[PDB]
Inverse folding.
């Protein structure tokens, strides 16, 4: 890279990270989608 | 309605092979409980053998009975020859399976299945 | 040498299926409807057998669709509805058969687009 | 475009966030919620609209065969810009 | 034509002639004879003919199919006899291959071909294991590929892909146990067939 | 006592012919006499004709009308209309 | 005798004269490729994909439009035919955009697939492509018109099926564009069908956009419940979520169309759902609870009441299995107050005779009628697929249609006789000239809208309309087996409830206000707490929190029509069943199972434990309810008309005015479509 440097992009990490497994920086998986079904919320005033 | 037989030509002939298989299984349980160091009693093992035989009591096709005996003898051979391990023998007893609900109300409370 | 066997063919005891997935299932025997998004009719030639849909739930970790139904993906293909019914009968599944729906023959006439006195005349081409 | 919910969890670019009563956020306790901070919707918006002289322009996303399939964008409407369906670049007929 | 597989008419003619030859000599058993467009000869026989037909092809001076390349089954549920038994044979003398096919259902035994080819021993065990076809007079018929005590015949078209049970280690009983299968992600069924016919040459009459 | 009458019959089977005669001749007069009683007539092809009576608290009886004549149908109707099972 | 012999690749086939070349190929199982041809639209002949060689003829013919001649041999696989297909496909793809990855049609595209099967495998087009600007035609149909191949299917469908002449072509040659020219929205109750018939991704569903690919969807064949037509549908699901609704072809019901409410209201199933049992807490507010606790509270009250103190109302979307289960449960406490929200006059025969409340002619029978008299109905919005059948007979059979009621736009021209109910007497008396049309007619059809029977004088209107149909049958002008009298229902659950012996309307409840009321998906607000004693115990069972739920003491979450296998009977009396596409959300349960579970806890166990057993029960009450897809005839119109004359009732002076006069009134009619955000967008679009 001192002779053929990589192409620069604004989104490329400026700071490389090594393997973070076993540390508080480890990746934890989760679902990235929002709730699919909306439940009906009952009214907040008595009226039976 | 004219088919090739497997071993038996009628139910009486087939029912003989069933009885011979039952005796073989009956006499093998004590050695199975000892060889595999099972924690079940000999009575439990025989009670399990009888239960396995009884759920097939409604069969009236000799060819189906012949295959059940054929498969039952393979299972016995696997056991007597210790091809099975302890896990395989105890799989008949479903020890880690919790009791599923049988009545309508219990099934209704837990899920949608019939 | 052959023998005589008059009992109805029944193999439920030698197929290895657990009891739950024999008695409590409902097989549907049908010819799939044409996908309305396409005009091709080649997926409507054969009879199919599928089973009743059971619960799918969200996996707590990733949100993937989990299932406990071993038959959820099973789909068999048959030449005729007799073959499908025969298969369902010997496996002990209760079933529903829906009669094949064939598009009824239409009367087409390009000339009607320009009728002298009928409503079939088209206002645009 | 990362913002934090009232409970402090970062919201993803897909809008995902565990709500206040969700037990599932226990998975981040002692660890972290991985969130990418380069929101593409924000980055594409910064790109200037490209002024062209023709009614129809083509976009392949740049880089020739390293971009996307080449598509042609009609620029007759004057109210809005033409937007590439693959890469989001915008065009306008001067 | 660079992209088209060339035809071989000489081999097609030779195989067709031998197919009629076999059909003339064992009419008692031969039901159908066909040669494919890529020149593979198939003999379809009544299941009673397994031993006579295989013996003839192994031993006859104009056949000498001394090697059993493969023996397998195919499950076709729409057929009354759902299992198609396929023997693939090789003749080193005449540098030729032939395929013999018969059929059976769930309850009809097929005669074991171990007397003709010792190679058939394990192939028949595999067919029994994976399809449940019983071979009569086998020296030792039992499962070969599946776990001990495994129920069912997985290669049948109606056996579910992931099966009915799955295994895990249970600490309470200190052993591996089997339990009904639950999948964190269900296998996703895809409907891929195009609604437009691809091959007119194989169109079935309506 | 009585809460609901139901009559099942086929539209064309000869076994339902008597029920068909009863409906076309006597049902209208029956309905006039029992103005506030549900008499659910339900035709279905190839079904054996039947007479269902429902009493208080969901008790039901069913009488077969197969091959009955219009008179027997009348008789069966009178038996149900005088019961309190 | 009439048939002529033609040959398809040498195979003889006998066809009626006028059969096209394409149709003759169908007869031997050969499907000619096509784009512009649709068998339910007028022939166009413009795409040229159907060109086929005729043996000994130098010129290929357009198979879709060319009538087959005697002795012709149609070569469907000849070199000339194949090269013709390759050439046409090459032209179709020359300007087509490289959009497949971003285009929703991908994977179920007739352009893709016929390119794969009949086109070349490469391009020799070296120029730049056409690009066309997009048209906004409303919130339902997205347009990406650069994909349009100018097949004119959408134009023909709009003009012929929908009866709306807003789509057309502007310009000429390669610049010819499909659209409305001006800025106009294509808002029709059948508009969404142009998505299906557009062979390419030029017209696509806005709600569905980008969410799924065809190969990954599971298809569940079901039935629509948004009206009483009983349209057959396919519910596409993926990984446990309903993705979209598609028509399913049924020649005798909806053909291959569905209404926009049937197509797009499914997104209401994801909103305002009831997922847990709820009971009122000490402060009078609904709070989540277990099934055990919720049913114990309901069972306690049920055991403490009898007879007229217990009543039930069934809503519009309720299935037959639940209807009989609730009827059985209330009968076991000697309660017979099983009511529906939709009224049907009980005067005379009432619900004793099916023919009194059925569309006896059937939907397909409209095509055989010669005069249709519509009374007090707007079938365009009450039964869109039924109105489409009327227009089809109007278009092809020259059917004469007359209306009594508000002069709504029906998409075809009709004779407006007026909105006064008094016209029925004039026609029956013979003074009115239109009565002479009915006498001359051989197969007249008289249709009374159920929405008209919701008036206070519904019994009088039903009697008056029946009197007309009885005069027609007394005049001997009709065949004999042809049925004249018809009732056009608008509620999916109505006919099954009448079949089971429910009381139509909530009049019985208003006479004897019960102490315990069951609301089974009853969201019409017919009975509110003002009409009930101060302490009335209200149990709501349903799938949506809408009108009934907020007033209830106990909420039992039920299943929607996509989440159960349930029996619905359409306006003709045809029983059909849905299938489970996805299971009910949360703790919701199948509706008949809830009632069966409640019966056990209340010490009154119902005698059925499975879907098959409760369907055996339905057969005992009304045998037709288990004859799926069958239309069982109903007789005894003469006996019904006699009882109809026994009691005299006066027509009110009010004009007949249907509940839905314009498209804005069509989109929201039930709890599912009221919760649908797509339906709200449609309402906003057509009003603003
Ligand atoms: S319409 Fe068909 S061919 Fe055209 S971009 Fe869409 S998927 Fe591809
Ligand atoms: S928009 Fe679709 S249906 Fe209409 S002309 Fe274009 S391709 Fe045909
Ligand atoms: S399908 Fe015949 S020209 Fe278009
Ligand atoms: K489309
Ligand atoms: Zn781009």
């Amino acid at each position: 890279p001192t002779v053929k440097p990589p192409t620069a992009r604004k989104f490329i990490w400026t700071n490389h990270k090594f393997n973070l497994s076993g540390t508080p920086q480890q990746y934890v998986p989760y679902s990235t989608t929002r709730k699919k079904i909306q439940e009906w919320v009952p009214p907040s005033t008595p009226y039976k | 309605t004219s088919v090739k037989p497997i071993f038996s030509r009628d139910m009486n002939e087939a029912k003989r092979r069933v009885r011979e298989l039952y005796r073989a299984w009956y006499r093998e349980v004590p050695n199975t409980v000892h060889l595999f160091q099972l924690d079940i009693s000999v009575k439990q093992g025989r009670d399990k053998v009888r239960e396995m035989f009884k759920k097939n009591a409604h069969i009236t096709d000799p060819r189906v009975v012949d295959l059940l005996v054929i498969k039952g003898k393979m299972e016995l051979e696997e056991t007597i020859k210790v091809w099975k391990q302890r896990t395989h023998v105890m799989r008949f007893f479903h020890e880690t399976e919790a009791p599923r609900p049988k009545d309508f109300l219990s099934k209704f409370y837990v899920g949608h299945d019939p | 040498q052959l023998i005589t066997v008059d009992e109805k063919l029944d193999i439920t005891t030698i197929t290895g299926v657990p009891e739950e997935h024999i008695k409590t299932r409902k097989a549907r025997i049908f010819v799939p409807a044409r996908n309305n998004m396409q005009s091709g009719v080649n997926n409507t030639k054969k009879w199919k057998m599928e089973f009743d849909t059971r619960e799918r739930w969200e996996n707590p970790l990733m949100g993937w669709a989990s299932t406990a139904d071993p038959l959820s993906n099973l789909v068999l293909t048959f030449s005729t509805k007799e073959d499908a019914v025969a298969f369902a009968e010997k496996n002990g599944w209760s079933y529903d058969v829906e009669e094949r729906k064939v598009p009824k023959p239409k009367s087409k006439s390009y000339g009607a687009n320009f009728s002298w006195n009928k409503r079939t005349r088209v206002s645009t081409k | 475009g990362v913002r934090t919910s009232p409970t402090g969890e970062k919201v993803t670019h897909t809008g995902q966030v565990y709500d206040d009563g969700d037990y599932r956020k226990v998975r981040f306790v002692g660890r972290q919620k991985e969130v990418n901070e380069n929101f593409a919707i924000d980055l594409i918006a910064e790109q200037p609209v490209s002024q062209v002289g023709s009614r129809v322009i083509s976009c392949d996303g740049g880089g020739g065969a390293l971009g996307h399939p080449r598509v042609y964008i009609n620029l007759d409407k004057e109210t809005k810009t033409g937007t590439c369906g693959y890469c989001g670049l915008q065009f306008r007929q001067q | 034509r660079p992209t088209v597989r060339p035809r071989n008419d000489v081999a097609h003619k030779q195989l067709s002639a031998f197919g009629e030859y076999v059909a003339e000599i064992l009419p008692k058993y031969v039901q159908q004879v066909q040669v494919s467009c890529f020149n593979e000869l198939e003999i379809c026989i009544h299941p009673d003919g397994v031993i006579p037909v295989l013996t003839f092809l192994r031993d006859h001076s104009n056949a000498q199919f001394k090697s059993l390349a493969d023996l397998t089954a195919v499950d076709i549920p729409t057929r009354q006899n759902r299992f198609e038994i396929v023997y693939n044979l090789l003749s080193l003398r005449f540098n030729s291959r032939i395929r013999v096919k018969t059929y059976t259902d769930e309850l009809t035994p097929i005669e074991s071909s171990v007397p003709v080819y010792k190679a058939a021993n394990w192939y028949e065990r595999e067919i029994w294991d994976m399809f449940g076809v019983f071979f009569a007079n086998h020296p030792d018929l039992r499962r070969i590929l599946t776990d001990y005590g495994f129920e069912g015949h997985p290669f049948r078209k109606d056996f579910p892909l992931s099966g009915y049970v799955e295994l895990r280690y249970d600490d309470e009983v200190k052993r591996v146990v089997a339990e009904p299968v639950e999948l964190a992600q269900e296998f996703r069924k895809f409907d891929l067939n195009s609604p437009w016919e691809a091959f007119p040459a194989y169109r079935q009459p309506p | 006592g009585l809460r609901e009458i139901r009559i099942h019959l086929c539209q064309r089977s000869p076994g339902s012919q008597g029920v068909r005669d009863f409906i076309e001749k006597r049902y209208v007069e029956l309905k006039k006499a029992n103005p506030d009683l549900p008499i659910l007539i339900r035709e279905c092809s190839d079904v054996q004709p039947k007479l269902w009576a429902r009493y208080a608290f969901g008790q039901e009886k069913n009488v077969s009308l197969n091959n009955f004549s219009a008179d027997q149908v009348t008789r069966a109707l009178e038996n149900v209309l005088s019961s309190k099972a | 005798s009439n048939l002529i012999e033609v040959f398809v690749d040498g195979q003889s086939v006998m066809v009626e004269p006028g059969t096209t070349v394409l149709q003759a190929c169908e007869k031997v199982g050969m499907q000619i490729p096509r784009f512009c041809y649709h068998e339910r639209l007028s022939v166009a002949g413009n795409c040229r994909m159907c060109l086929v060689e005729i043996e000994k003829a130098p010129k290929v013919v357009a198979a879709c439009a060319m009538p087959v001649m005697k002795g012709w041999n149609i070569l469907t696989n000849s070199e000339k035919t194949k090269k013709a297909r390759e050439g046409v496909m090459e032209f179709l793809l020359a300007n087509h955009p490289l959009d497949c990855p971003i285009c929703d049609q991908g994977g179920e595209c007739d352009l893709q697939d016929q390119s794969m099967m009949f086109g070349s495998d490469r391009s020799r087009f070296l120029e730049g492509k056409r690009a066309v600007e997009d048209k906004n035609i409303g919130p339902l149909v997205k347009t990406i018109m650069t994909r349009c191949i100018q097949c004119t299917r959408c134009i023909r469908f709009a003009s012929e099926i929908a009866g709306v002449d807003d789509l057309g072509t502007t310009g000429r040659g390669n610049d010819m564009q499909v659209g409305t020219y001006i800025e106009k929205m294509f808002m029709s109750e059948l508009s969404g069908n142009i998505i299906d018939i557009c062979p390419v991704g030029a017209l696509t569903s806005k709600p569905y956009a980008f969410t799924a690919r065809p190969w990954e969807t599971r298809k569940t064949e079901s039935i629509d419940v948004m009206d009483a037509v009983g349209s057959n549908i396919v519910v596409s699901t993926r990984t446990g979520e309903v993705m979209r609704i598609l028509p399913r072809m049924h020649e005798d019901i909806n053909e291959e169309w569905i209404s926009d409410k049937t197509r797009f209201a499914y997104d209401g199933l994801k909103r305002q759902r009831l997922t847990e049992p709820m009971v009122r807490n000490e402060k009078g507010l609904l709070t989540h609870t277990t099934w055990e606790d919720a049913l114990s509270r309901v069972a306690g009250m049920l055991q403490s009441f009898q007879g007229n103190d217990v009543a039930a109302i069934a809503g519009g979307l309720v299935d037959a299995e639940a209807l009989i289960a609730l009827k059985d449960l209330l009968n076991r406490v000697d309660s017979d107050t099983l009511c529906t929200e939709e009224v049907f006059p009980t005067a005379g025969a009432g619900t004793d005779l099916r023919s009194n409340y059925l569309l006896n002619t059937t939907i397909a029978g409209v095509e055989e009628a010669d005069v249709v008299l519509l009374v007090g109905t707007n079938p365009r919005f009450e039964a869109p697929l039924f109105n489409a059948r009327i227009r089809k007979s109007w278009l092809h059979n020259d059917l004469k249609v007359a209306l009594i009621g508000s002069p709504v736009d029906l998409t075809y021209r009709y004779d407006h006789l007026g909105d006064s109910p008094k016209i029925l007497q004039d026609i029956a008396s013979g003074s009115h000239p239109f009565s002479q049309v009915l006498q001359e007619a051989k197969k007249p059809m008289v249709i009374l809208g159920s929405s008209a029977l919701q008036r206070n004088d519904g019994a009088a209107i039903l009697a008056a309309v029946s009197n007309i149909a009885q005069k027609i049958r007394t005049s001997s002008g009709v065949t004999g087996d042809w049925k004249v009298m018809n009732i056009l229902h608008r509620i999916a659950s109505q006919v099954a409830a009448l079949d089971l012996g429910y009381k139509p309307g909530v009049e019985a409840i208003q006479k004897n206000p019960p102490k315990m009321l069951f609301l089974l998906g009853a969201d019409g607000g017919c009975i509110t707490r003002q009409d009930l004693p101060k302490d009335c115990f209200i149990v709501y069972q349903g799938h949506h929190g809408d009108v009934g739920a907020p007033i209830a003491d106990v909420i039992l979450p039920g299943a929607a029509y996509t989440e159960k296998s349930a029996t619905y009977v359409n306006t003709e009396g045809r029983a059909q069943q849905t299938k489970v596409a996805v299971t009910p959300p949360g703790l919701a349960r199948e509706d008949w199972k809830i009632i069966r579970a409640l019966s056990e806890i209340a010490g009154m166990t119902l005698p059925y434990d499975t879907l098959d057993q409760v369907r055996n029960r339905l057969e005992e009450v009304s045998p037709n309810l288990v004859r799926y897809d069958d239309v069982e005839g109903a007789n005894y119109f003469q006996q019904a008309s006699e009882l109809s004359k026994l009691v005299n009732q006066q027509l009110l002076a009010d004009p007949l005015v249907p509940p839905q006069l314009t498209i804005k009134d069509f989109y929201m009619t039930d709890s599912i479509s009221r919760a649908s955000q797509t339906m709200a967008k449609c309402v906003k679009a057509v009003t603003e």
In short: The pocket of iron/sulfur cluster (ligand 2) is lined by residues G 148-154, 178, 198-200, 202-203 (CB under 6 Å). The interface with chain D takes residues 97-99, 101-102, 128-133, 146 of chain G (CB under 8 Å). Residues 458-474 of chain G form the longest helix (17 residues). The radius of gyration of chain G is 28 Å.
